[PDB]
Amino acid sequence: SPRIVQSNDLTEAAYSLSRDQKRMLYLFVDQIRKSHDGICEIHVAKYAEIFGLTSAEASKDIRQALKSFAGKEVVFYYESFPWFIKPAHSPSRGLYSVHINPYLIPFFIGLQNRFTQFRLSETKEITNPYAMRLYESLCQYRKPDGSGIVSLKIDWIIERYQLPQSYQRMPDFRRRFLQVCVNEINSRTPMRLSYIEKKKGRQTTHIVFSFRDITS
Template identity: 30%
Template sequence: MVFYIIGPRTPSAVIFYPKEGRFDCVARPWLTEAGSRSARGIWEIEFNHKLLRYIYGLTNQFTTYSLRDCGSLRNPRTIRLYESLAQFKSSGLWVTTHAWLNDRFLLPESQQKNLAELKRSFLDPALKQINEKTPLLAKYSIDDSGKFLFSIIDKQNPV
């Protein structure tokens, strides 16, 4: 029960389901420490040592983008939306659900329960900023089943 409450709603933790050992579900935070020197604009982070073998082992199936691409975005949810869109720029299509958006972006209750509020106060302004300030051009529609269909174009390499 505890993992269900903090696991899916905690974006900074990785959830493991080991086949052996004491636990059948383990949540591990990405970072053990994060500190900033705000006057200099510098962040120093320290990864959890129990995750290092997974981090070092990454060779494919991850998303990269230049921080310059989204450096002018200021809202953390807008930046996270940009990251999600960047994952699908090669295919040009991202299909997701309202429930997934709720969990990924830790949306306030008003946006979780009211689709019009979600669009008005998060998706539309965030996409406007992304379209104006980044190399991505994105728009969305909602199909008959309620799924969000995002179309994504890389302005630097349009297909």
């Protein structure tokens, strides 16, 4: 299963992509690392096989994700970059060509430290894109035995994962982000994950996540 590797600056970046858009980005990163000008491709049949879909559903997912990439940017901590520099197109039936911004390529190759790595198998069943964001941030601090302890500030999560307004007040945050995403990770990944809310007096300031691998 392919190893997704990226700069920690990307794991921490402010962006908002759908689940399917992040699935495609995983494949783009693998292509970039295994090949720069940024031009990548996606075969519907291969996507369907990787993610366990019919070609019909894969084509629908891919077409919607590629269309919705229009105008999407990533913000590094600011500096903002478009993900794509041309619309995706289809040279052959079942095949799509994309041009990832060449300025984003250094976030995926030539990394010698401060990088995040995980296997595609770890994330390919996640359905919630904010749970994917959280999973990657946990992988960023994962120890060689598969465990880790990660403290994230709540205002940082809101800003970098670009949570909608309906997520940001602490009842909603706890319910819409924390509970759903942690339970999604526990259900659909090899990570076993718990958390504690830390409070500065009255205000809940950060979340301390503790995790282990199901491989124990």
